Amino acid sequence: ARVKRGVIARARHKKILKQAKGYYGARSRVYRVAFQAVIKAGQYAYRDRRQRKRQFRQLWIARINAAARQNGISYSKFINGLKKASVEIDRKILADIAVFDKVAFTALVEKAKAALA
Amino acid sequence: MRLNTLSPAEGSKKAGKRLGRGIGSGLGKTGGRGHKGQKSRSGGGVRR
Amino acid sequence: MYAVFQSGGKQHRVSEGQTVRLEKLDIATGETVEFAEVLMIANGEEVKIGVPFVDGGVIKAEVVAHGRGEKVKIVKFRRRKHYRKQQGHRQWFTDVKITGISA
Amino acid sequence: MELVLKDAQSALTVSETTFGRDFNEALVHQVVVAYAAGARQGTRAQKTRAEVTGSGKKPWRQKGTGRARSGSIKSPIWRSGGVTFAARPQDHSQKVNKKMYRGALKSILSELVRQDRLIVVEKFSVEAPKTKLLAQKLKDMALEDVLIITGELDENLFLAARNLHKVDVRDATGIDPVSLIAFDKVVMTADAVKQVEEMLA
Amino acid sequence: EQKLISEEDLFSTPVWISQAQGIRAG
RNA sequence: CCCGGCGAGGGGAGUGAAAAAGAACCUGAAACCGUGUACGUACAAGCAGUGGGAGCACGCUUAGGCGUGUGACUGCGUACC
């Protein structure tokens, strides 16, 4: 029962070189190099699904701050204002509203200003 | 009852080990021997 | 006119005719859902929440599709410790079309 | 416990412990695996590094040359003369308990009855040793893929069946487990039953 | 042809040591 | 029948089911070497990946911010055994 390996080994290597398309030099041509590149791609990919959720919130916060200060209040007080007014609109939605409807956002600044005074 | 409808008693044909065949098997590398020393070697170990 | 509502443990800003992708809802793909907990309604004028949720505010919507998102590969790898894994994931979703914003 | 005769209309009384007992799947399986193992020509070998032709000069030193250390041109890592664990001729046969074999035959035979694959007749023989003669008969009985077991090693019947691929002939003494399974129907003479019965008992 | 095969090749092997130069040296 | 040193090599015709079966002749992988289109790059510094992600080019997204290619900027990031 002699087993020749050529057919199975090609299929296994081809899967890897396929995952490595777009990489530079040997990393998209040479199995040994590609294999290390594809794993590391996976390592980073896992990690940055966690990181992605961090980066977006920092962006929303940063934008609300600018728009809050435009209506004459700091981020820290505006959020506190909304909490004591029991407004629960999150920062994804608030940063969206900060950009596309400045008049609705100003109305949320008053809502949060009334509660805070 | 045909020659392709007969199958073994449950639990009666345990698959047994195949060492040195990679991470997934759980016994790839070293082969359950640990690292180094007399017990790890080819032919290696002490008498009765 | 748009509105804000909660459904997938997350919030969405939507208008009439818009399709929005939510977490899985146990509803057949021709039936109608109502979202009766709405965080904001804005038209010419805009009624926002005080108590969380708008009092008279209801959003009605039609379930259009169930399905799964494109597959993602999970890799774990501990260098020099002869350890690795891989795994697949597809996340469920329901798509709904907003047919009514009731103010 | 009665098996109806095909045409004579004279039912035949048989032991329910032989022809009427439950199917033991694990047991029958074990006897069929061992029969197939018992049929091997365990005939093979390869060459160990001791049996590869060549000499045991070190191809090139324990030190100083830039190459990997070598000892034998017949090392199994080397091109030519590999085969780390070469094969020998070996015996693939397995033991079967007398009782486990008989127990197994009885279970299969009892199933044959239940599945209407066992056919009993008063007589089964042929006139002249012409396969064509048999062929006519088999069509007439509506049989095609069939094992024939007769009372005595009938020769005409034996000769006539040899070129018919879907037909085999057997005396009661020469039966085996896999033949009784390998055909769609099985034909036994009245005499054949009495001999099989005594044998399993 | 055009046999195209003059070479054996049977490539030669040098051995063993021309230079043993130091040093550490002790 | 041509180019061609009365050359090696071609290009034609013809044989041939098929010459990308034509004498380094079944099929005919990658490494490696080539030509052709798309996008990117001469003020920008590093396991060259991944998370964002403007612009351009295709496939209409074949009415709806859809598939692919490429992908400036920026955030996280010291290969394996």
XYZ file of C-alpha atoms (C1' of nucleotides) in Angstrom:
576
model
C 0.000 0.000 0.000
C 2.438 2.650 -1.240
C 1.018 6.203 -1.103
C 2.307 8.905 -3.491
C 1.879 12.442 -2.156
C 1.969 14.809 -5.140
C -1.797 15.353 -5.570
C -2.632 16.097 -1.909
C 0.461 18.247 -1.201
C -0.192 20.583 -4.162
C -3.775 21.205 -3.005
C -2.581 22.040 0.534
C 0.139 24.439 -0.722
C -2.183 26.079 -3.270
C -4.652 27.060 -0.504
C -1.889 28.984 1.252
C -0.477 30.799 -1.795
C -4.080 31.776 -2.521
C -4.450 33.375 0.929
C -1.162 35.247 0.307
C -2.131 37.167 -2.878
C -1.111 40.852 -2.829
C 1.862 40.354 -0.513
C 5.272 41.566 -1.698
C 8.079 39.450 -3.197
C 8.531 35.849 -1.973
C 5.596 36.195 0.451
C 3.122 35.717 -2.416
C 5.251 33.244 -4.422
C 7.211 31.048 -2.039
C 5.288 28.610 0.185
C 7.655 28.663 3.194
C 7.464 32.463 3.333
C 3.765 32.680 2.426
C 2.808 30.242 5.179
C 4.362 32.478 7.859
C 2.719 35.543 6.244
C -0.771 33.979 6.222
C -0.655 32.979 9.900
C 0.526 36.421 10.956
C -2.289 37.837 8.849
C -4.643 35.747 10.976
C -2.985 36.828 14.237
C -3.374 40.477 13.398
C -6.863 40.034 11.988
C -8.107 38.488 15.269
C -6.528 41.253 17.342
C -7.788 44.151 15.253
C -11.398 42.999 15.400
C -10.979 43.898 19.092
C -9.026 47.089 18.265
C -11.593 48.234 15.642
C -14.230 48.611 18.368
C -11.811 50.839 20.325
C -10.823 53.114 17.406
C -14.385 53.931 16.292
C -15.566 55.039 19.760
C -12.518 57.333 20.088
C -13.532 58.891 16.788
C -17.174 59.408 17.821
C -16.058 60.903 21.166
C -13.558 63.200 19.422
C -16.248 64.520 17.043
C -18.921 65.054 19.707
C -16.352 67.077 21.665
C -15.820 69.449 18.712
C -19.575 69.787 18.107
C -20.331 70.130 21.828
C -17.761 72.931 22.186
C -19.361 74.552 19.121
C -22.577 74.917 21.177
C -20.507 76.110 24.169
C -20.046 73.014 26.369
C -17.309 70.404 26.865
C -17.697 66.729 26.010
C -17.523 65.699 29.668
C -20.388 67.970 30.746
C -22.525 67.273 27.649
C -22.460 63.488 28.291
C -23.242 64.089 31.972
C -26.089 66.384 30.939
C -27.563 63.668 28.705
C -27.251 61.031 31.458
C -29.099 63.121 34.060
C -31.676 63.953 31.387
C -31.910 60.161 30.871
C -30.961 60.499 27.190
C -29.418 57.199 26.047
C -28.674 57.977 22.373
C -25.204 56.462 21.948
C -22.130 58.155 20.432
C -22.283 56.379 17.070
C -25.698 58.033 16.560
C -24.672 61.347 18.213
C -21.547 61.669 16.031
C -23.733 60.952 12.986
C -26.206 63.649 14.136
C -23.280 65.986 14.906
C -22.332 65.910 11.192
C -25.623 65.716 9.239
C -28.067 67.674 11.457
C -26.353 70.381 13.506
C -29.784 71.771 14.518
C -30.943 68.493 16.094
C -27.584 68.263 17.887
C -28.020 71.798 19.289
C -31.444 70.677 20.551
C -29.673 67.805 22.381
C -27.226 70.322 23.893
C -30.126 72.316 25.383
C -31.796 69.105 26.598
C -28.512 68.254 28.336
C -27.945 71.864 29.487
C -31.375 72.143 31.147
C -30.813 68.968 33.195
C -27.282 70.021 34.159
C -28.340 73.400 35.609
C -27.839 -8.789 5.455
C -25.381 -7.994 2.667
C -21.573 -7.683 2.640
C -21.996 -3.881 2.878
C -24.499 -3.764 5.776
C -22.340 -5.359 8.493
C -20.686 -3.041 11.035
C -18.762 -3.501 14.299
C -19.989 -3.615 17.892
C -20.048 -0.203 19.567
C -16.704 0.773 21.131
C -15.110 -2.443 19.844
C -12.638 -1.075 17.239
C -10.776 1.718 19.038
C -8.556 3.604 16.558
C -5.188 3.534 18.368
C -2.320 6.019 18.240
C -0.259 7.524 15.389
C 2.623 9.613 16.808
C 4.645 12.407 15.208
C 1.813 13.631 12.931
C 1.490 17.306 13.869
C -0.259 19.695 16.251
C -3.846 18.467 15.863
C -3.213 14.841 16.834
C -2.007 16.117 20.226
C 0.990 13.759 20.200
C 2.978 15.393 17.378
C 6.664 16.073 18.155
C 8.461 14.124 20.900
C 5.700 11.470 20.728
C 4.662 11.360 24.384
C 8.295 10.906 25.484
C 8.900 14.387 26.882
C 12.285 16.031 26.215
C 15.739 14.387 26.345
C 17.293 11.901 28.810
C 17.601 8.120 28.580
C 13.840 7.349 28.332
C 13.445 9.591 25.260
C 15.948 7.719 23.059
C 15.758 5.063 20.394
C 16.018 1.775 22.273
C 16.301 3.844 25.425
C 15.342 2.803 28.970
C 16.403 0.587 31.869
C 16.063 -3.138 32.567
C 13.672 -5.051 34.869
C -38.079 62.137 8.347
C -35.809 59.752 10.258
C -36.006 57.958 13.610
C -33.780 56.158 16.123
C -34.563 52.746 17.623
C -33.061 49.805 19.514
C -33.191 46.160 18.369
C -29.864 44.277 18.089
C -28.674 45.491 21.487
C -27.523 48.407 19.301
C -29.128 51.532 17.825
C -29.812 52.660 14.250
C -30.828 55.923 12.559
C -33.285 55.138 9.745
C -35.855 56.658 7.340
C -38.862 55.269 5.459
C -37.970 52.974 2.556
C -34.543 52.248 4.061
C -33.334 48.682 4.650
C -31.368 48.060 7.880
C -29.495 44.936 8.979
C -30.235 43.712 12.530
C -29.434 40.784 14.816
C -31.587 37.706 14.193
C -35.349 38.153 14.733
C -37.616 35.075 15.025
C -40.007 36.268 12.285
C -40.855 34.868 8.828
C -39.610 36.794 5.768
C -43.089 38.123 4.788
C -44.436 39.196 8.200
C -44.424 42.718 9.713
C -42.564 43.735 12.907
C -43.196 46.760 15.134
C -40.462 48.495 17.142
C -42.297 50.292 19.956
C -39.209 51.531 21.852
C -37.909 54.531 19.882
C -35.182 56.908 21.060
C -35.856 59.864 18.717
C -38.142 61.079 15.917
C -37.161 64.004 13.669
C -39.202 65.454 10.787
C -39.686 69.177 10.055
C -39.630 69.346 13.843
C -38.090 66.801 16.258
C -39.473 65.049 19.371
C -36.669 63.527 21.481
C -36.735 61.256 24.552
C -36.769 62.361 28.195
C -37.882 59.254 29.844
C -36.141 56.815 27.563
C -38.418 56.163 24.546
C -40.860 58.442 22.710
C -44.358 58.276 24.226
C -46.592 58.067 21.115
C -43.695 56.742 18.992
C -43.925 53.452 17.057
C -41.830 52.130 14.135
C -43.463 49.496 11.895
C -41.271 47.404 9.558
C -41.342 44.365 7.251
C -38.906 41.443 7.579
C -37.245 40.996 4.163
C -34.449 38.422 4.659
C -32.646 36.073 7.025
C -29.078 35.086 6.151
C -25.437 34.873 7.225
C -22.592 37.346 6.714
C -19.358 36.560 4.909
C -17.133 34.043 6.674
C -14.275 35.250 8.905
C -11.271 33.172 10.011
C -10.118 33.141 13.646
C -6.456 32.278 14.246
C -4.729 31.645 17.565
C -0.984 31.021 17.558
C 1.523 30.740 20.429
C 5.024 30.907 18.958
C 7.692 28.396 20.098
C 5.105 26.549 22.256
C 3.939 24.181 19.493
C 0.444 25.644 19.730
C -1.992 26.915 17.156
C -5.662 26.828 16.167
C -7.969 28.021 13.451
C -11.757 28.430 13.441
C -14.603 29.751 11.248
C -17.484 32.131 11.983
C -20.630 33.307 10.212
C -22.959 35.728 12.053
C -26.756 35.573 11.666
C -28.756 38.660 10.648
C -32.273 39.765 9.737
C -32.899 42.516 7.152
C -36.008 44.692 7.631
C -37.504 47.474 5.481
C -38.976 50.465 7.309
C -42.525 51.003 6.042
C -43.811 53.461 8.683
C -42.494 56.004 11.186
C -45.425 56.853 13.477
C -44.735 60.063 15.414
C -40.726 -23.819 12.992
C -41.482 -24.989 9.435
C -39.928 -24.033 6.086
C -42.362 -24.459 3.178
C -41.150 -26.553 0.221
C -41.385 -24.685 -3.093
C -43.412 -27.142 -5.234
C -43.863 -30.539 -3.501
C -46.092 -28.708 -0.932
C -44.625 -30.801 1.904
C -43.490 -28.464 4.699
C -40.207 -29.394 6.409
C -39.672 -29.291 10.177
C -36.406 -27.658 11.291
C -34.798 -26.617 14.586
C -35.889 -23.116 15.653
C -32.549 -22.730 17.478
C -30.742 -23.028 14.107
C -33.122 -21.423 11.557
C -35.316 -19.254 13.836
C -32.942 -17.325 16.128
C -32.028 -13.630 16.345
C -29.416 -11.849 14.215
C -26.159 -11.191 16.115
C -24.555 -8.367 14.115
C -21.285 -8.085 16.074
C -20.659 -11.852 15.917
C -21.397 -12.305 12.192
C -19.197 -9.311 11.377
C -16.235 -10.886 13.205
C -16.502 -14.209 11.293
C -16.722 -12.466 7.877
C -13.638 -10.297 8.579
C -11.594 -13.367 9.615
C -12.589 -15.411 6.534
C -11.376 -12.626 4.239
C -8.183 -12.316 6.323
C -7.842 -16.107 6.148
C -7.806 -15.901 2.343
C -4.655 -13.750 1.992
C -1.432 -14.717 0.287
C 0.600 -12.800 2.887
C 3.335 -12.633 0.252
C 5.476 -9.495 0.212
C 8.811 -8.068 1.276
C 11.051 -5.041 0.975
C 14.778 -4.598 1.646
C 16.087 -3.235 4.960
C 19.248 -1.141 4.943
C 21.028 -4.478 5.535
C 19.609 -5.985 2.309
C 20.259 -3.080 -0.077
C 23.205 -3.874 -2.332
C 26.329 -1.744 -1.925
C 29.176 -1.282 0.558
C 29.503 0.210 4.028
C 32.318 2.682 3.393
C 31.523 6.064 4.961
C 30.651 8.199 1.929
C 32.617 11.135 3.474
C 34.071 11.847 7.075
C 32.749 12.831 10.554
C 34.248 16.256 10.190
C 35.659 19.180 8.219
C 33.749 18.836 4.988
C 30.904 21.332 4.621
C 28.359 18.548 3.984
C 25.928 16.849 6.361
C 27.450 13.873 8.197
C 27.000 10.512 6.493
C 27.651 6.894 7.471
C 26.000 4.677 4.874
C 24.949 5.148 1.253
C 22.009 2.842 2.237
C 20.641 5.136 5.030
C 16.849 5.250 4.556
C 16.932 9.085 4.247
C 19.173 8.586 1.162
C 17.984 8.210 -2.395
C 18.118 4.477 -3.135
C 18.041 1.858 -0.378
C 15.368 3.459 1.784
C 12.675 1.286 3.424
C 13.138 1.955 7.124
C 10.690 -0.785 8.260
C 10.710 -3.341 5.414
C 7.956 -5.952 5.125
C 8.293 -9.728 5.549
C 5.973 -12.425 4.325
C 3.390 -12.679 7.134
C 0.374 -14.774 8.222
C -2.828 -12.678 8.270
C -5.095 -15.496 9.500
C -7.073 -15.100 12.751
C -8.376 -17.658 15.253
C -12.123 -18.248 15.441
C -13.655 -20.186 18.359
C -15.445 -23.349 17.165
C -18.568 -22.052 18.928
C -18.312 -18.488 17.557
C -18.116 -19.888 14.035
C -21.149 -22.168 14.405
C -23.099 -19.470 16.276
C -22.353 -17.126 13.379
C -23.479 -19.572 10.656
C -26.771 -20.074 12.468
C -27.532 -16.321 12.775
C -26.952 -15.690 9.045
C -29.031 -18.760 8.003
C -31.889 -17.645 10.279
C -31.888 -14.215 8.615
C -31.959 -15.838 5.158
C -35.284 -17.464 6.133
C -36.662 -14.142 7.443
C -35.660 -12.250 4.272
C -37.079 -14.981 1.962
C -33.631 -15.587 0.395
C -33.524 -19.273 1.394
C -35.294 -21.690 -0.982
C -36.062 -25.311 -0.055
C -36.861 -28.085 -2.552
C -37.323 -31.874 -2.482
C -34.784 -32.485 -5.251
C -32.315 -30.331 -7.162
C -30.345 -31.922 -9.997
C -29.685 -31.710 -13.746
C -29.662 -34.313 -16.532
C -26.670 -33.884 -18.904
C -23.612 -31.743 -18.004
C -24.660 -28.777 -20.214
C -24.596 -25.277 -18.675
C -27.304 -24.332 -21.212
C -29.571 -27.001 -19.687
C -29.109 -25.471 -16.232
C -29.622 -21.950 -17.634
C -33.056 -22.974 -18.948
C -34.010 -24.415 -15.536
C -32.865 -21.339 -13.598
C -34.957 -18.974 -15.744
C -37.936 -21.312 -15.206
C -37.468 -21.068 -11.420
C -37.112 -17.265 -11.754
C -33.580 -17.444 -10.292
C -30.457 -15.648 -11.558
C -27.920 -14.693 -8.859
C -27.922 -17.840 -6.721
C -25.928 -20.290 -4.587
C -26.820 -24.001 -4.955
C -26.192 -26.400 -2.058
C -26.991 -30.060 -2.807
C -27.113 -33.318 -0.825
C -24.131 -34.970 -2.495
C -21.431 -33.362 -4.663
C -23.496 -33.848 -7.846
C -21.114 -33.758 -10.813
C -23.360 -32.934 -13.794
C -24.752 -30.075 -11.701
C -21.191 -29.149 -10.728
C -19.948 -29.085 -14.365
C -22.992 -27.265 -15.772
C -22.593 -24.413 -13.236
C -18.906 -23.605 -13.681
C -19.235 -21.127 -16.578
C -22.387 -19.500 -15.134
C -20.940 -16.555 -13.209
C -24.034 -15.845 -11.086
C -24.325 -19.528 -10.044
C -22.245 -21.705 -7.705
C -22.732 -25.354 -6.658
C -21.729 -26.831 -3.306
C -22.182 -30.031 -1.309
C -23.451 -29.494 2.267
C -20.031 -30.436 3.727
C -18.217 -27.666 1.794
C -20.324 -24.619 2.788
C -18.806 -21.322 4.029
C -20.100 -18.035 5.604
C -19.444 -15.531 2.784
C -21.031 -17.587 -0.055
C -24.329 -17.826 1.875
C -24.331 -13.993 1.926
C -22.824 -13.198 -1.490
C -25.818 -14.416 -3.544
C -29.313 -12.948 -3.883
C -31.058 -16.300 -3.326
C -29.815 -19.616 -1.856
C -31.146 -23.052 -2.931
C -30.999 -26.146 -0.691
C -32.195 -29.709 -1.293
C -34.265 -31.498 1.382
C -31.222 -33.720 1.927
C -29.030 -30.592 2.115
C -31.117 -29.243 5.032
C -30.784 -32.448 7.079
C -26.988 -32.359 6.633
C -26.679 -28.651 7.506
C -28.978 -29.181 10.522
C -26.908 -32.045 12.002
C -23.719 -29.978 11.469
C -24.962 -26.962 13.499
C -27.427 -28.749 15.793
C 24.239 14.717 -34.382
C 23.311 17.053 -31.531
C 24.063 14.472 -28.853
C 24.667 17.454 -26.593
C 26.395 15.291 -23.987
C 30.172 15.687 -23.797
C 30.356 16.040 -19.996
C 30.578 13.074 -17.619
C 30.168 15.180 -15.664
C 31.494 13.238 -12.639
C 32.289 16.415 -10.684
C 35.460 16.252 -8.576
C 35.718 16.412 -4.783
C 38.514 18.264 -2.999
C 39.901 17.061 0.336
C 40.817 17.735 2.905
C 42.643 20.563 4.640
C 45.005 23.083 3.155
C 44.652 25.634 5.990
C 44.500 24.950 9.749
C 45.231 28.503 10.923
C 44.669 29.863 14.438
C 44.229 31.217 16.909
C 42.568 31.478 20.339
C 44.787 30.019 21.238
C 45.068 28.537 24.719
C 7.507 27.216 -52.207
C 10.145 31.274 -49.192
C 13.671 34.061 -45.748
C 18.071 31.890 -44.649
C 26.406 30.907 -44.985
C 24.245 24.441 -51.090
C 23.959 26.894 -42.957
C 21.267 26.034 -37.853
C 16.691 28.052 -37.322
C 12.249 29.641 -38.975
C 7.409 31.161 -42.155
C 4.225 29.160 -45.530
C 1.734 24.604 -48.052
C 0.851 19.346 -47.480
C 0.339 14.619 -44.282
C -2.144 13.975 -40.269
C -9.020 13.001 -35.617
C -5.670 16.502 -33.266
C 1.207 19.016 -34.865
C 0.247 24.478 -28.447
C 1.053 14.936 -30.903
C 6.477 17.023 -35.393
C 11.966 13.708 -33.386
C 15.503 18.347 -25.965
C 7.962 14.209 -29.529
C 1.347 11.351 -23.947
C -0.309 15.000 -19.985
C 2.316 18.478 -18.699
C 2.603 21.828 -11.750
C 5.731 25.433 -9.123
C 10.781 27.736 -8.446
C 12.669 30.535 -12.071
C 12.558 33.639 -16.607
C 9.359 36.361 -20.107
C 6.091 39.823 -23.069
C 0.836 42.412 -22.741
C -3.377 45.596 -20.092
C -5.290 47.901 -15.098
C -3.870 50.734 -10.947
C 0.147 52.604 -7.626
C 5.283 55.280 -6.825
C 11.170 60.524 -7.434
C 9.532 65.206 0.715
C 9.127 60.301 1.818
C 12.256 56.414 6.809
C 11.740 50.384 9.822
C 8.940 41.185 10.455
C 6.123 45.115 4.808
C 1.410 42.774 7.818
C -3.639 44.016 9.629
C -7.770 47.946 11.391
C -9.619 52.235 9.186
C -9.445 54.234 4.643
C -9.906 59.186 0.468
C -8.792 58.747 -5.398
C -8.615 56.153 -9.997
C -9.790 51.803 -13.461
C -13.246 47.664 -14.674
C -17.658 44.504 -14.393
C -23.361 48.643 -14.806
C -24.516 48.924 -8.904
C -27.166 45.655 -15.726
C -32.286 52.743 -12.107
C -30.953 52.023 -6.096
C -23.473 54.379 -2.475
C -23.319 46.056 -5.455
C -18.685 42.291 -7.597
C -13.342 42.947 -8.814
C -8.662 45.390 -9.471
C -5.544 48.939 -7.625
C -5.243 51.451 -3.482
C -2.629 57.685 -1.429
C -3.097 59.021 3.887
C -3.529 57.269 8.956
C -4.257 53.622 13.758
C -2.048 48.916 15.706
C 2.159 45.906 14.859
C 10.517 43.060 16.655
C 9.581 36.363 11.158
C 9.632 30.735 12.202
C 11.991 26.404 14.862
